[PDB]
Amino acid sequence: HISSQQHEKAIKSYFDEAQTQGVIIIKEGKNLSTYGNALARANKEYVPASTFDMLNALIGLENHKATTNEIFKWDGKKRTYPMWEKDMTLGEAMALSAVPVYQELARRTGLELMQKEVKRVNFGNTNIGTQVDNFWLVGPLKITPVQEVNFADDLAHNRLPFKLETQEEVKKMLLIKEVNGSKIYAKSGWGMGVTPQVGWLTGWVEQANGKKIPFSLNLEMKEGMSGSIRNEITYKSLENLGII
Ligand SMILES: *C(=O)[C@H]([C@@H](C)O)[C@H]1C[C@@H](SCC/N=C/N)C(C(=O)O)=N1
Numbered sequence: 578h579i580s581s582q583q584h585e586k587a588i589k590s591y592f593d594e595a596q597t598q599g600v601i602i603i604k605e606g607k608n609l610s611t612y613g614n615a616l617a618r619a620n621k622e623y624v625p626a627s628t629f630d631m632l633n634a635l636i637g638l639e640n641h642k643a644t645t646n647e648i649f650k651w652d653g654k655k656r657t658y659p660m661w662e663k664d665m666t667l668g669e670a671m672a673l674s675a676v677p678v679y680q681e682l683a684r685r686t687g688l689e690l691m692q693k694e695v696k697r698v699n700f701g702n703t704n705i706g707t708q709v710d711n712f713w714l715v716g717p718l719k720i721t722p723v724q725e726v727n728f729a730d731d732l733a734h735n736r737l738p739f740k741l742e743t744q745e746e747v748k749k750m751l752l753i754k755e756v757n758g759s760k761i762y763a764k765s766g767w768g769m770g771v772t773p774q775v776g777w778l779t780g781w782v783e784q785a786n787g788k789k790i791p792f793s794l795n796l797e798m799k800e801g802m803s804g805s806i807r808n809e810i811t812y813k814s815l816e817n818l819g820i821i
Pocket of ligand 1 (some may be wrong): 627712767768769
């Protein structure tokens with residue numbers, strides 16, 4: 578039916594219409610596909626921002642710094658967003674992208690064990706510097722869209738070097754949507770303290786029949802852009818390609 582020239586044009590147009598520059602990478606089996614209106618972003622490094630929450634949670638659970646039902650208490654200080662002003666589990670923090678919880682979890686892990694775990698997993702440029710609580714927000718940790726989709730593919734298939742149960746626990750935190758028998762698992766990201774600002778949505782689709790299709794959207798966020806544009810472009814793309 579639909580030519581690949583048309584698929585490429587439809588998906589480029591989604592990014593064009595949002596007046597941003599971005600790419601979305603799809604992986605089917607071993608094969609990577611790059612779509613969007615800025616294909617060269619695919620092998621450029623950007624801060625992972627909140628997408629790091631996935632690995633942060635993996636490391637924390639594996640090293641017994643937390644459990645999946647522990648409540649991280651709000652310390653009562655004003656937060657950037659009122660939705661963060663409450664007690665929550667890692668899983669709720671994952672859905673709300675509650676940075677203060679992931680910061681508390683990074684601190685419990687500590688710089689030393691974090692650096693080793695990040696090197697061990699080979700995540701991005703694997704460099705976390707000297708500040709345990711912000712390396713994924715302002716650098717020096719960086720990662721490419723290709724690396725992110727490969728990380729997602731790894732997690733989707735339990736290939737990261739953590740126990741199966743750790744991986745399963747983190748994955749259950751990432752379920753964001755069901756669409757005609759397809760389950761979408763994803764982590765969003767928005768690096769507000771870098772110039773320019775980077776937007777992420779990294780995840781996979783689990784189809785009815787069990788096949789898992791990893792994706793990673795990467796784009797430039799601009800002042801007065803809605804966060805849900807990351808989702809809308811992703812769903813439109815995955816739908817255009819008949820993945821969902
Ligand atoms: C991670 O990338 C972010 C951190 C650097 O600030 C958080 C902040 C949110 S913005 C709106 C929050 N609403 C969530 N339900 C965000 C994001 O949308 O990814 N990531």
